[PDB]
Amino acid sequence: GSHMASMEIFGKTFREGRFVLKEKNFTVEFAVEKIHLGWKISGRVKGSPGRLEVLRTKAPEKVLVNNWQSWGPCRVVDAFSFKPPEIDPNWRYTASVVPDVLERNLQSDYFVAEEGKVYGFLSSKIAHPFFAVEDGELVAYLEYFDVEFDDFVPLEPLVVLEDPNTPLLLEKYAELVGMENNARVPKHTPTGWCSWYHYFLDLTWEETLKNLKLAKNFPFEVFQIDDAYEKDIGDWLVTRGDFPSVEEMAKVIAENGFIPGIWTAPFSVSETSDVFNEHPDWVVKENGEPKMAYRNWNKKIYALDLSKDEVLNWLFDLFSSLRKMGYRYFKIDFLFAGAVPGERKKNITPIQAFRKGIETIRKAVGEDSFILGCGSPLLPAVGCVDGMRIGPDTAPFWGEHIEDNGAPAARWALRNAITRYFMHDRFWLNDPDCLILREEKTDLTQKEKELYSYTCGVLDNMIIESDDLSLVRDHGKKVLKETLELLGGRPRVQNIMSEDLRYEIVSSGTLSGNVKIVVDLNSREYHLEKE
Ligand SMILES: OCC1=C[C@H](O)[C@H](O)[C@@H](O)[C@H]1O
Ligand SMILES: [Mg+2]
Ligand SMILES: [Mg+2]
Ligand SMILES: [Mg+2]
């Protein structure tokens, strides 16, 4: 095709074959090979590749772009009329791991799509793979963060797929990612309860116990304590308020017949924490001093340096201790912190460091524990997590005055469940964030609760409820029951390039047979048909 002859690969005219590029500072050896639905570019690199240009082609007008982490948008953008965002200096790295790009040009992490075409990297093991629109050209890069390689390391493979069925392409892409990374796709999806979206930081053990008793009347397997119990970020085995010990909490939850679950932010240590105050050289640095990874909880939060053996040992000991207590469901959050650019003890990439950290956690919790990632780089976590939050936080409100900028809102949480649907049952189980089904202490309507819940069910996504269970009555019980009956299928979002927040979603082979739901996030309406 005329468009394919127009591509450049490592600066050379596109064509099938086997090539060597010897530059001043680096060497690439790569192959361009035909695969089903398109092409694969793979090989190996050594030296100092820096920010390595892999592919160049003319930019499409409308592109599906993807943020690197859980909370960031996956959405269709007009590439021509793009203006750089103002990046919040307290959250710079959720917006981009290469913020020099985003402050100038449109950025997409891991993959980008247009009608009929997907460009997608199959892994992020060493480099960060991304796309930029640079003076009207789409450019694919592998970022090596100034790391030098004495011997060859593998490229992250790039595929270029074409077919009129864009959803089929994204599904194919994700199947290839799953194979490249030995994705975990559990045969069972947990149900359960989470404290966060009712109680927030104000959870008490008294209220937890009330819910633990009521949970016996609900179809919940896991009972997960969120952020509230811990005295500080990093001090995960020290509790506060009316909480008992972390070990005692697990025992109470297990005595009551649930799988105990717990939230941590394990790559994060606050400026006030015992662990940071004891171990000031355990963190990622800038000009030799602690580098803020983000600000949250009204504190500067630092990133653990996952290149250091002392740090990995501490993480192993923490998670193995939690396993010994009986926790078997782990929500591990703010994981981007582990992958911040900066100075580390070993001269490895932030992505290499990140992967050492999450692999340590998996080793510690064992094969029989469920790991839910959150706030996380997506591609580097494939093969390690069982489930992954794939959108910004939901909320007990639709979010009429909330922009698509990452503040909590049911409407934007649900958008990302739809636009990242194709990762589900291929990368991991997708977590669309919790259902909020209470009928007091909420501004959600019955129709909004139904729209969110039934969409998650058609998508076969994880179903976790987050409510004061005393405030969930006949409607909320009915909605959860019906939602669980929509699970089990193979979903497809038929019109993935939609720009008006209306989506047509089918799922084959659910517990309710073949189903279709049309959802309109702007009118807050749905139309569900079950065969
Ligand atoms: O601090 C608790 C918390 C923070 C993040 O915004 C998560 O996505 C949210 O679900 C909650 O665990
Ligand atoms: Mg005690
Ligand atoms: Mg989510
Ligand atoms: Mg499934």
Numbering used by the authors: -5 to 525
What does the paper say about this structure?
Of the GH mechanisms that catalyze glycosidic bond hydrolysis, most that occur with retention of stereochemistry rely on two active site aspartic acid (Asp) and/or glutamic acid (Glu) residues. These enzymes employ sequential SN2-like reactions, each involving an inversion of configuration, where the first generates a covalent glycosyl-enzyme intermediate and the second one hydrolyzes the intermediate. As a result, we hypothesized that a galacto-configured analog would covalently label a GH36 α-galactosidase, a member of GH clan-D, that has as its main structural element a (β/α)8 fold, which is the same protein fold as found for family GH13. Here we present the synthesis of three cyclohexene-based mimics of galactose including a 2-deoxy-2-fluorogalactose analog and the kinetic characterization of their reactions with an α-galactosidase from Thermotoga maritima (TmGalA).
To obtain structural information regarding the enzyme-bound species, 3a was also soaked with wild-type TmGalA crystals. Following an overnight soak with 3a, the structure solved using data to 1.22 Å resolution revealed electron density consistent with the hydrolyzed form 5 in the active site of TmGalA. The interactions in the active site were essentially the same as for 3a, except for the addition of hydrogen bonds between the C2-OH with Arg383 and Asp387, and C1-OH with Asp387 and a water molecule. Thus, within the overnight timeframe 3a had been hydrolyzed with retention of stereochemistry at the pseudo-anomeric center, yielding a Michaelis complex of the reaction product. In an effort to observe the covalent intermediate derived from 3a, crystals were soaked for various time periods (from 5 s to 8 h) with 3a but did not yield any additional information.
